[PDB]
Design a binder for this molecule. Sequence first.
Ligand SMILES: Nc1ncnc2c1ncn2[C@@H]1O[C@H](COP(=O)(O)OP(=O)(O)OP(=O)(O)O)[C@@H](O)[C@H]1O
Lengths: 295, 212, 741
Amino acid sequence: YKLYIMTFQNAHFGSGTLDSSKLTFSADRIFSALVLESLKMGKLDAFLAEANQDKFTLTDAFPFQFGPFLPKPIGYPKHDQIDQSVDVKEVRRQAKLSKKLQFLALENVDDYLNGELFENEEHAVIDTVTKNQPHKDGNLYQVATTRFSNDTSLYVIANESDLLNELMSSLQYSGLGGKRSSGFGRFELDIQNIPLELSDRLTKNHSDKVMSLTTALPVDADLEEAMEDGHYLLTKSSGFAFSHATNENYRKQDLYKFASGSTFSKTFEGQIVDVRPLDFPHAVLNYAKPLFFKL
Amino acid sequence: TFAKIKFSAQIRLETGLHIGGSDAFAAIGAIASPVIKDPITNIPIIPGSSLKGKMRTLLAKVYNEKVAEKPSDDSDILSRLFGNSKDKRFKMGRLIFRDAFLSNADELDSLGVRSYTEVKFENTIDRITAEANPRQIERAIRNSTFDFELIYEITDENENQVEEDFKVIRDGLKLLELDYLGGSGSRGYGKVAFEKLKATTVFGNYDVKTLN
Amino acid sequence: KEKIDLFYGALLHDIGKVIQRATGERKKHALVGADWFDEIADNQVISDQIRYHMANYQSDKLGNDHLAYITYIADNIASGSAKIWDTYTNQADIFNVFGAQTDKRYFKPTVLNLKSKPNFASATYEPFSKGDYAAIATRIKNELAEFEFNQAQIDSLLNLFEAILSFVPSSTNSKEIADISLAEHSRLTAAFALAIYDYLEDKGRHNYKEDLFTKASAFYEEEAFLLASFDLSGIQDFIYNIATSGAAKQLKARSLYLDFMSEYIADSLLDKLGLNRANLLYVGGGHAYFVLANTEKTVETLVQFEKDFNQFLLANFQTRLYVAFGWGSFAAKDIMSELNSPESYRQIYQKASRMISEKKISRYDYRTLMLLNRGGKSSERECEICHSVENLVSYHDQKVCDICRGLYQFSKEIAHDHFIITENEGLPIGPNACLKGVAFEKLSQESFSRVYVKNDYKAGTIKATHVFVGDYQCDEIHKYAALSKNEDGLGIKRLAVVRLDVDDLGAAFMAGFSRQGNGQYSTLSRSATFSRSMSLFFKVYINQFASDKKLSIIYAGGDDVFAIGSWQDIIAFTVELRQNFIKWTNGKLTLSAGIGLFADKTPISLMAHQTGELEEAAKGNEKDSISLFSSDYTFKFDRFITNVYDDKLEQIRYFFNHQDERGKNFIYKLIELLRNYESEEKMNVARLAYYLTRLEELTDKDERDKFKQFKKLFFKWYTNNESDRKEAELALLLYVYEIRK
Ligand SMILES: Nc1ncnc2c1ncn2[C@@H]1O[C@H](COP(=O)(O)OP(=O)(O)OP(=O)(O)O)[C@@H](O)[C@H]1O
């Protein structure tokens, strides 16, 4: 499998509320875009039977600035791995920056566990604008933008085949998150040849102090042993559904999954949960497959 | 069946206009009407939301079938080009804009200019006294190009009014050239001109029909 | 019976020291308060504990197991005389033994009142402390008479003991033991007196050591104490979250919903275990510490309480509200006797802090997590307030749910001074308890009661444990931009948002008292009075300085606050409040903030979120910095008043004011000329010398001293240093907004 490289600028990626926005984005945001364009193109009965093929998976948002970036491990270092806090004045001034850290570089994935505390590089500044609506007198909303600079890209790793190359190629001329009606979500698809020789520790078999990402959800069956002696971080993601027959826009059920970079100790399974409020002619399904890293 | 029709053109400003934004933002003083720009570089960029609310307003008065009382409800023959929250036959439209940036900086610096925007002095008469409220505004420069992107796509299922939709987009872009664009254009500040109006297909499914 | 009277013995064990200062009696501090309390009251059990304590022995009127022997072990934990003749010092300074050694400071035993002026410590007061003070014992007289000592009247004594005795020293001995106040010495030792009685009772042991515990060296080495602490998360995210612009009225009521939640933790947990309010050590904002005992029955109490306190917080809320406990056993020898290294004192807090960072990232578990991922709701109309669909009702125009339902009614209820804790009527804050106000008419009162500003001239039949929270408000929230205009016409429809947050508080807190190898500087009472003295200024003293100004404090605490209102005085009041904290600490603890201006009628979800990034961006230099509008004016915080506000702001209010109106547009070319600075430096200097000389001949030449003082200062403030040009640029920008509209 290969990987896709794309960048964003002057876009919008909300989180929780329409007026609020963040830098990265969840993993289920990409999967919800390929299904919408499959019915419009003419292959709805072909993309549904491809995502549930086990070997086909997706990733979350990862920055790309002169090298790939990886999230920090949750829980590391522990109380014994970290150095002894002899002087509390010199430890509290550097331990707070590790909690607010976003992502780590590709050359610091092996030295962070031995003792390395530094400030993360600033990706982009948060910019916001304002609009209104004349001929109404009674509407004033606030929206934000994600204007990236200093060469900031958000690559994605998927399973390259003879059908995926024709699906995500037309996505750059559309939108992905934020105000799509204005033109927030366009990117530039860039393909290469030989992937990175360093980030090749992705497997789904053994479980020897691994770490699952992509903000996946564990299976409903095995959970007592997988969650035991582990860590996670609950998030928040909800919203209305996409349909054309219903005239009420029902609110979908929330799916408080985990976060990226959560360490565990047992191989998960990764199933497909069905979320249906009342009734819909289509089918709302969740993806987010876990990906383990050897660390 | 499914393709992306891109109308690559160059918006040449024949007259300096003005676009308002947030108070005390993208500048240093909340006076002389601060023009919104780019948060990274000092390039007066134009937002894509101004072209969505202006092109649809001027379109609902030449090709409509219902009294335009509120957006997403005025008629139906033109609501499929932007969006509609009440109708359920279609979710959004078939036109996507983009924040055009000033790409005329490759040759503007050779002439030797100071700033990209200037301050204009205006006032008004209260019809009973002399000069009333000596205000001031901020305008941009003319003879500047912009990279405008007009993406058009078909929904395959409703592939029957393709030729009917081409005469509407061409008429909407031509009518915009004969009217102001932005803000405070009643005195003669807007009036743009879509220079080099050409179309291309970057996909491989639908051939090029017309050019202008 | 045997336990209710024990709580009063640890509070009045040194009450005779105050009477000894006024009335000339040379005998013993343990004998003055014994005979004085027996005259007003009439009890025999408490008369034996106050009588003998130190240098008295007295093996009479006792059997084998009497509640009078555990009062000596708990008294030595808070610490580190016979006839009196002189006084060394009168309440030593706490900040003086913290950090470096500067000028000597001396407090004054005044009256803790909101309307009274604070007693700043300085070298003006007499350090000899003459034995008099006819006002320290006059107040305590009628309030002590007629008072039943039972279970229902056990918490009302603590609300008065610290009302005027907060500036009274306890056991003035040399310099190491002198800064411990009497209000904090008797309050901290009350919790240790109950932990000893509960440790021997659960393990099956009586007071076999008659007449002075001879096993004092063996008892201090055995771990028989427990340090519990919680960390309430979801304060800056649940409160600062809104989707509509018309919901700005319930902003004050929303911040008070989580303020009383932390106070309920220190009430139901202390009463279910079998204790009182002796464990209250700085409660407010989800950060508090509780001392217990290393037993076996008290351990199962906190485990069962945390499983039921988060049960009812799952159906009404989602997952942003969670309380993570943190226990940590320790020994009594870590704060006394040997062990002079700071590692022995910091080891107690590390045993209860490593699990906090682990439990927060491991909240819910099996089965319980499946409650949120059930799937049964089929609603389509949300509330657009708290992003939750539960019990929808129409009151204004949209559909109000259940969480934000009581916030609108509570907004017009904060003005009530007294509160009544009900069961199923009001804002739900606990399992089966609510909270609501009352117009001074108690018609129910089932649980307890919590009030405020209860200090002086308020000690009748109220019966309510007062807290520390603001209450001074103005009128609404979405209208300060319109009332920011006087009569001549100045200012526009804007507002400023500042978030004051003191620094040097989370770090150097446990080992910040080391300065001499003799004293250990590890007494728990030394750290208790350090956080209590600063907690009085960031909450109570804020309402006192709020006079003659229109403001509205939001979320009062000793960490981070939230101010909003007209920007015509917040800018001048933010730097003025810091000047009062430097004199209080003798210039030892820095302070930071973040003044942020936005537009009118803006959503709080992004307005209050962008004003907090200025404090994080100002940490690039060191620890003392602040930002103004954007992220470019990052000075040194204190440098803003010593240069910009000093001469660059005072010597300009009457120089260019005479050239206003007719020449107001002449200042616009000055703030714009300093914009293009990274281009060419040689051209930026020659161009400035042209537009500046034109302001001397065009103006009135009758007064030579009108522009001469402004021309010389403007040339030196611009051509002197690269970083100095930012001071003159910000000073000229603030003068434009002063006179406008
Ligand atoms: N009066 C107090 N008593 C006990 N603990 C307190 C008190 N005030 C604050 N704290 C603790 O301090 C913590 C907050 O630390 P804070 O964020 O202020 O550190 P900081 O000033 O940012 O550190 P640095 O200056 O190194 O950046 C809280 O978790 C709280 O538990």
